[PDB]
Amino acid sequence: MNNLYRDLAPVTEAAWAEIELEAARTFKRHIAGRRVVDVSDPGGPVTAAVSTGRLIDVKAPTNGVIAHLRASKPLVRLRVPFTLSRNEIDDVERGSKDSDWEPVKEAAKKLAFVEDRTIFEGYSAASIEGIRSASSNPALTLPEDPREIPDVISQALSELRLAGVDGPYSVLLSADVYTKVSETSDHGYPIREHLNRLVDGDIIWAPAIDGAFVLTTRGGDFDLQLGTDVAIGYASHDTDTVRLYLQETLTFLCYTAEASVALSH
Amino acid sequence: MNNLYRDLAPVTEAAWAEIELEAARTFKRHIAGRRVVDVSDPGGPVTAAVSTGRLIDVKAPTNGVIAHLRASKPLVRLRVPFTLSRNEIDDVERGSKDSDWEPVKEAAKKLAFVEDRTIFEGYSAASIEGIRSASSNPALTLPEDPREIPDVISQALSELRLAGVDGPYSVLLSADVYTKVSETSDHGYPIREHLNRLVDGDIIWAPAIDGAFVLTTRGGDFDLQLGTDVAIGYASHDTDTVRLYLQETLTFLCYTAEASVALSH
Amino acid sequence: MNNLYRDLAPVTEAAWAEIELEAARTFKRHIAGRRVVDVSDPGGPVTAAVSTGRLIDVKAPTNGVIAHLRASKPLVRLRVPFTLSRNEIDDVERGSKDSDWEPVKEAAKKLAFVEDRTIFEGYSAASIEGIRSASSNPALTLPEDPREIPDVISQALSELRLAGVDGPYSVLLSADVYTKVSETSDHGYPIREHLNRLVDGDIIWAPAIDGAFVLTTRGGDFDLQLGTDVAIGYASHDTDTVRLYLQETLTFLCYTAEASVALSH
């Protein structure tokens, strides 16, 4: 067995298939970051750091010796525990199709939110700079009126053009901004369609982020490094409940500072 | 070896591939001129002039002798030096993917700007007349209001129609004008889309030019002659930096005076 | 080419072969550490850190999220520059066999001394704990009289026996201690032979270390990780001299605290 200790969990095979399906579905729906960044293959469990290729000056060991430390970025392992009713698990073999997988959905939504907020806003404790912090283009303010959203977005499209950047540009919106441009309409279309006319990429719902992000998806600018992708593991169990977790280990690198514009309220 | 002296540069193979990729990418993005003019095959290093096929009267050598000089256009070699950190070059073999290629990008942007400004505004010292100067159609004034841009552009489309010209017409805009028609919107579309409806060619971002240019891309009207295309060459190096250059040799010919309209502010 | 920039050096092929032979020979003679520790295959230039498999508690990103940083050990790149006369280099093609390779020998001796002192005494700036510091067995004092050396060494052999350890034990001596037990004799043998009778391993000359070390060579206790093994690289040159360097990148790990005894004066 492995670190998931999956065979020790009192979960049947059919219940496991339903839990895997629910977690994978809810996660994909709430991920916006993997649609725009380069996603590496999983390195594996032993992978601990990503080389940046830079060098750090250290106090010379002896006379005439020049020493340099190799710089690297550590992976962070992110774990979201959740708790399942054993009655709901037992219902699945009897043929129930409405078993309560709400904790699985909440854990997948929380893991997806962490991953997206780590990619776009950073996680300083894990030495990850967000796309918002690593952007060299000027930051823009989103207006109160949703009918004035496409104007400011177009100004962001000016800045990537002034930065000398090609590629399909894509706009990612926070859930508040996505709702505002979805529910306001002008001439038989919502403002989301007006945003769709400005770019050759995609208007992407990004419920974890704040503000908005416009960026190129030409490739090679944004890199998500995975040691291991999302997995479900077993912690402990009692007569009534099974404690499990969702787990993934990653770091994020931004190679190109001028490939994005961040917007705030 | 050749005049690039490329093997003498202290640049690794992987670093060379990254520099070539960065320079080629940034150059294409900033070229507008090659999308509309006929571009010849590279003549080669020995190519020095392009025959125009005209004749120049010279003082008769002797009695009964009629002499004429063949007219030609000289090529100009354009060189943009740039300077790279050797630490950034050394980072590439160690696996860095964020090496500072800003000087390469600035050199490619500057070379592209020179080439486009030479094609459209001319370079008198190199005996190159620009498209703006060689146009026989009347010049138009671009209005201050971007909502009045498509009107004047349509008047330019009248002039090529009054000049008796067929073919897909294409509109090239300066970066100021492109930004103005991109960021102003009317009825759910930016003014750039309104320009796109007027022509069967393309709205082309041309950040080097001034004003705007409307012209036919039927072929055979505008000819860019290349002796050698863009190449990267090695000048000199020290402990910290490598001096290199971008280099291209060309001339530009406009055969058809009535195939274009220039616009100014 | 690579980071060594070897083809840029004004060094002939025969001179290169002599320099490689001299450096490799002098290095092996002065290495004691690789004879007793496990030496990994070279990871390669991109390798920057070694995973330890441990976890570091970090401030929770959000509520209900448990985060942990993966622990790792950075590699250190160690570079010893040296300077060669170009006349000595030119002598080699003419058939000289006494070309002055003293700087190569001094650079190889200095690199070997650094590597051995890093393995056995540590390099705190590179986060490397030495075998002396990581040993859990008690430290012993070497006596002034060399005839009393084998007694104390035998007490060290008691401690590894009290630590519950098997395997061929090996004794490494500093150059002072090796000279003292080599030059003092008892009953027709030097004291080095008396040390040789106590162990089934080897009396190893270790000129870089202080004191003495007794340890098991059963395997899996001491691990030297190499990104890249010893290589010769080219820095710069003038009319008279060529500046080159010896370079290696490594870290050292001690997995088993009770597998060694350190001795001091």
Residue numbers in the entry:
A (entry chain LA), B (entry chain UA), C (entry chain OA): 1 to 265
What did the paper state?
The overall structure of Enc subunits across species with different T numbers is conserved and consists of a peripheral domain (P-domain), an axial domain (A-domain), and an extension loop (E-loop). T = 1 encapsulins of Mycobacterium tuberculosis, the causative agent of tuberculosis, and the closely related Mycobacterium marinum, are known to encapsulate the DyP as a core cargo with iron storage ferritin protein (BfrB)28 and FolB as possible secondary cargoes. In vitro cryo-electron microscopy (EM) single-particle analysis of the Mycobacterium tuberculosis encapsulin was used to obtain three structures of the encapsulin shell in intermediate states, as well as a 2.3 Å structure of the fully assembled shell.
This resulted in structures of three distinct intermediates of the encapsulin shell; a 48-mer (3,427 particles, 5.4 Å), a 52-mer (4,378 particles, 4.5 Å) and a 54-mer (6,294 particles, 4.6 Å). All three intermediates have an even number of monomers, appear to be closed on one side of the shell, and miss subunits on the other end. The 48-mer has 39 fully resolved Enctb subunits (defined as cross-correlation value > 0.75) and 9 are less well resolved (defined as a cross-correlation value 0.5 to 0.75). The addition of these dimers appears to increase the stability of Enctb subunits that previously were located directly on the edge of the hole. However, all dimers (in total 77) have both Enctb subunits present, and where a subunit around five or three fold symmetry is missing, its dimeric partner is also missing.
